[PDB]
């Protein structure tokens, strides 16, 4: 169906003759090769989150939107400091990229090839508002970066194959994302479904004008999503930038968006700033025990210097001033904290995470300087109470199980992956997690075959609870680049530099009632 021309002589002389020279070339059969471009949209990885993303998390989660005045917020910070930025680890998109089989030089008979592309995560005074708007619109910008990276990958592939003997008969895409690369991935897939002209432009600029058959913007073979969170934070309450409209992110996956679509979902992700965009009911979706970065990866190993140790406020710390004679355990804040602790000890959301650490109510008592009451003889103390969870050396081995489930789904879809070998010791599963991984893989098959997965038993869910991180907490963070109105909760970016104040956010605050917000399609 395709034809090329073998050229004996292919050079000529320029002049004022402007002579046209025949170039006799014989007509050679040309292979039709199906070229698949693996698009890998990461979240955060072995990187820290930039200031703009962390400040976006202030939206709806600042200490002012909660009933936490600035004095109480500084007391929360002091409390946490007295009881006890973050860089993540390689995600599962990193490992899928490393394991995605790359084709560099095709064989004499090879009619299908794979090339791969890696796009980083969205988060990785004057500019600060523009930076937060860039993160807010990060999904579409990352799909544009994906187009440029597609051009680069096509250039590299056709630079490994000089004087081609083949025509690219089809351009396929295997799009993989972790959460903000997942919305981006979905957005990218929609741009491929809408046959975006920028995709065809990138394919042409990478093939350097070479003819490729098929849809000019390509087709998506497999869509692999790890935990779709379209936005982590917001800009609605930022006075400076809330005027900008929502980004035109397309997250709905219609039955022709791809040939196979698979999502894994975190069953124990409960944060407010991490709400799920689910494909359940329309496409195969597997809910798997774990947190957000226990499904998509991103937690450092047990023995690293960046080991994940959880010292977490599981209740918002509450402070009140009382008489110094009053017993700390006879205080309203202590009663509230104990109520929260007994609620969490029965909550099914943390049923399997709490038995692997110690859950306590922690009390802080400081003195309160009130000279007026000192003259009356009344000495006063500020008593604060919170619920604390302490767990040490949380293993990150459940994201390898989620990796293997996504690998099984993609390999069913037709994607070629290099085997997971003993050479990869970062991907090797503990014995405790070996059989469970098989079960998880089987569960994936069940959701892919349309059936219902055989759920993990409570003993199995306990063993998995060794490996799932508690990502929702009431730990307070601060920044000096914002001022939040104590009454309205509106955020005002310090456009001329920090003013010496501290604005307080609960970045990883749980969703209300400890139930994650799910947006279905």
């Amino acid at each position: 169906k395709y034809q090329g021309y073998d050229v004996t002589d292919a050079t000529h002389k320029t002049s004022i003759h402007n002579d046209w020279k025949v170039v006799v070339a014989k007509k050679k059969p040309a292979r039709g090769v199906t070229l698949t471009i693996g698009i890998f949209f990461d979240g955060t990885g072995n990187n820290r989150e930039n200031t703009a993303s962390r400040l976006m998390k202030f939206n709806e989660c600042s200490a002012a939107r909660q009933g936490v005045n600035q004095k109480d917020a500084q007391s929360c910070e002091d409390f946490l400091k007295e009881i006890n930025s973050y860089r993540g680890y390689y995600s599962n998109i990193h490992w899928l990229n490393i394991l995605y089989h790359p084709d560099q030089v095709l064989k004499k008979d090879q009619t299908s090839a794979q090339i791969k592309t890696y796009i980083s995560g969205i988060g990785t005074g004057m500019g600060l508002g523009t930076s937060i708007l860039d993160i807010f619109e990060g999904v579409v910008t990352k799909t544009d970066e994906a187009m440029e990276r597609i051009t680069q990958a096509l250039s590299e592939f056709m630079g490994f194959n000089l004087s081609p003997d083949f025509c690219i008969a089809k351009i396929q895409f295997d799009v993989f994302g972790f959460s903000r690369g997942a919305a981006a991935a979905r957005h990218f897939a929609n741009r491929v479904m809408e046959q975006d002209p920028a995709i065809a432009r990138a394919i042409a600029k990478g093939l350097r004008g070479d003819f490729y058959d098929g849809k000019p913007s390509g087709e998506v073979r497999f869509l692999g999503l790890f935990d779709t969170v379209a936005a982590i934070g917001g800009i609605s309450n930022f006075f400076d930038i809330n005027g900008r409209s929502n980004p035109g992110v397309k997250l709905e996956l219609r039955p022709s968006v791809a040939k196979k679509v698979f999502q894994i979902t975190a069953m124990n992700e409960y944060r407010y700033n991490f709400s799920l965009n689910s494909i359940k009911g329309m496409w195969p979706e597997l809910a798997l025990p774990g947190a957000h970065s226990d499904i998509g990866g991103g937690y450092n190993p047990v023995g690293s210097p960046l080991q994940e140790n959880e010292s977490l406020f599981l209740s918002c710390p509450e402070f009140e001033i009382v008489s110094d004679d009053t017993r700390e355990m006879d205080t309203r804040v202590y009663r509230k904290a104990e109520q929260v602790r007994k609620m969490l000890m029965t909550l099914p959301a943390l049923k399997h995470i709490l038995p692997h650490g110690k859950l306590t109510t922690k009390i802080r008592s400081i003195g309160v300087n009130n000279s007026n009451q000192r003259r009356a003889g009344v000495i006063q103390k500020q008593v604060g109470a919170a619920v604390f969870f302490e767990r040490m050396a949380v293993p990150n081995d459940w994201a390898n199980v989620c990796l293997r489930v996504m690998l099984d789904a993609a390999q069913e879809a037709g994607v070629l992956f290099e085997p997971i070998r003993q050479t990869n010791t970062e991907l090797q599963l503990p014995s405790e997690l070996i059989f469970l991984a098989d079960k998880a893989i089987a569960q994936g098959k069940a959701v892919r075959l349309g059936q219902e997965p055989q759920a993990f038993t409570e003993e199995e869910l306990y063993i998995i609870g060794k490996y799932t991180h508690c990502s929702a907490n009431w730990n307070i963070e601060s920044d000096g680049n914002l001022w939040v109105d104590p009454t309205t909760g509106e955020i005002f970016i310090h456009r001329f530099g920090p003013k010496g104040n501290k604005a307080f956010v609960f970045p990883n605050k749980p969703n209300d009632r400890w139930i994650r917000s799910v947006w279905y399609m």
């Binding site: 034809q3 002389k13 046209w20 020279k21 006799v24 025509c167 350097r208």
Partner: protein, 48 residues
Amino acid sequence: GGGFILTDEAGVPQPSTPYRLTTDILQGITDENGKTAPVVKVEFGKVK
């Protein structure tokens, strides 16, 4: 100036072959008489 003309081993010009003429790159597709755009070595692509 000048250009190329693509023909088979037997003299039938090839109408819509892609080409890349490099001196800077001038891409294009040959005309009905298998003629490049006026402008060097030419690389000819593939046809359906």
